[PDB]
């Protein structure tokens, strides 16, 4: 993304990069939150499974729900969000680097 966000040469450009970095960080946190919540839900169900008797109707219900979330985690939509997350982290890291390079160069 050195092409979309090249080395900065003006203060207005710096401000645009900051505004876009902020929007991207909001996007990143949103995606990350979905992945974190899926894992939190799996952990709650893991506790339920570890507690309920294996032969109970309750264990069967928890197992069904747990397996649905594991199906989501192994799904393409989940894989895509995780990938979008990584690419956004990369893009943001780059924008931050450009802003830092500029601020040092204007010192």
- Domain presence at residue 2: no
- Are the CB atoms for 84 and 91 separated by under 8 Å? no
Distance from the Cα of residue 31 to its chain's centroid: 4
CA distance 16 to 32: 24
């979330």: which residue's tokens?
69
Distance CA 6, CA 17 (A): 10
Within the chain, residue ranges assigned H as helices are 11-51, 57-73, 76-105
| Residue 43 maps to a domain | yes
**Domains held by the chain: number:** 1
Q: How far is CA 101 from CA 3, 73, 77, 87, in A?
A: 16, 38, 36, 21
CA distance linking residue 22 with residue 31, whole number of Å: 14
Residue 4 domain-assigned (yes or no): no
CA-atom Rg of the chain in angstroms: 21
Contacting residues for 81 by C-beta, under 8 A, at least 6 apart: 31, 34, 35
The range of the structural domain enclosing residue 90 comes to 9-107
> Which experimental method was this entry solved with?
X-ray
DSSP conformational letter for 4: T
Which residues lie below 8 Å from residue 103, measured CB to CB, with a gap of 6+?
14
| Long-range contacts of residues 41-48, Cβ cutoff 8 Å, at least 24 apart | 41/69, 42/66, 42/69, 42/70, 42/73, 45/69
- Within 10 Å of residue 61's Cβ, how many Cβ atoms? 13
Q: Residue 63's domain is classified under what CATH number?
A: 6.10.140.340
Find all residues with CB under 8 Å of 58, minimum gap 6, and list them. Answer: 48, 52
The answer to whether residue 1 is domain-embedded is no
Q: What angle do CA 51, 67, 89 make, to 5 degrees?
A: 110
């Amino acid at each position: 993304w050195i092409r979309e966000y090249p080395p900065i040469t003006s203060d207005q450009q710096r401000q645009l990069y900051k505004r876009n970095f902020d929007t991207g960080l909001q996007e990143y946190k949103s995606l990350q939150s979905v992945l974190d919540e899926i894992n939190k839900e799996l952990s709650r169900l893991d506790k339920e499974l570890d507690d309920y008797r294996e032969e109970s109707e309750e264990y069967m219900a928890a197992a069904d729900e747990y397996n649905r979330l594991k199906q989501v985690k192994g799904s393409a939509d989940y894989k895509s969000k995780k990938n979008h997350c990584k690419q956004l982290k990369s893009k943001l890291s780059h924008i931050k680097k450009m802003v830092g390079d500029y601020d040092r160069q204007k010192t």
